[PDB]
């Protein structure tokens, strides 16, 4: 489609845990190491919809809106049904990028 420069769910993006991110963390439900996302509200890690859809499940059972892909570090908002680019996402995207690419 077309990514958004903002969305009304950015307010749900929470502080990154001091433990940091582990981009190789497995899905908290199924333990897959593939195509995981991290929830930008509670930082639980769950798999994408092309694996077992545990992140989508987490959205449904928590309402948490925004998730970050450990594949390509894009942010998707489940409510807006769009990718979102915004300043509020840069820190988490960068901590993820550093952990991922060994920076």
Ligand X SMILES: O=C(O)CCc1nc2ccccc2c2nc(=O)c(Cc3ccccc3)nn12
Instruction: Give me the 60-79 binding string for ligand X, x by CB under 6 A, dash otherwise.
Output: -------x--------x-x-
9 annotated ligand binder: yes
Residues 14, 30, 56, 95: which binds ligand X (CB under 6 A)? Answer: 56
Q: Which of 20, 49, 94, 98 binds ligand X (CB under 6 A)?
A: 49
Contacts of 64 (CB under 8 A, 6+ apart): 12, 39, 40, 41, 42, 58
CB 62, CB 76: distance < 8 Å: no
Q: Does 18 bind Cl ion (CB under 5 A)?
A: yes
What is the closest distance, in whole angstroms, from the C-beta atom of residue 103 to Zn ion in the complex?
26
Annotated binding-site ranges: 7, 9, 27, 30, 39, 42, 47, 54, 58, 64, 77, 80
Give the residues lining the site for Cl ion (CB under 5 A): 17-19
């Amino acid at each position: 489609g077309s990514p958004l420069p903002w969305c009304p769910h950015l307010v749900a993006v929470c502080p990154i845990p001091a433990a940091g991110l582990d981009v190789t963390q497995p899905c908290g439900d199924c333990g897959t190491i593939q195509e995981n996302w991290v929830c930008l509200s509670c930082y639980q890690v769950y798999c994408g919809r092309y694996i077992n859809g545990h992140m989508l499940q987490h959205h449904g059972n928590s309402g948490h809106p925004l998730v970050l892909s450990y594949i390509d570090l894009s942010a998707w908002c489940y409510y807006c049904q769009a990718y979102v680019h915004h300043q509020a996402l840069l820190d988490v995207k960068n901590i993820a990028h550093q952990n991922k690419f060994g920076e």
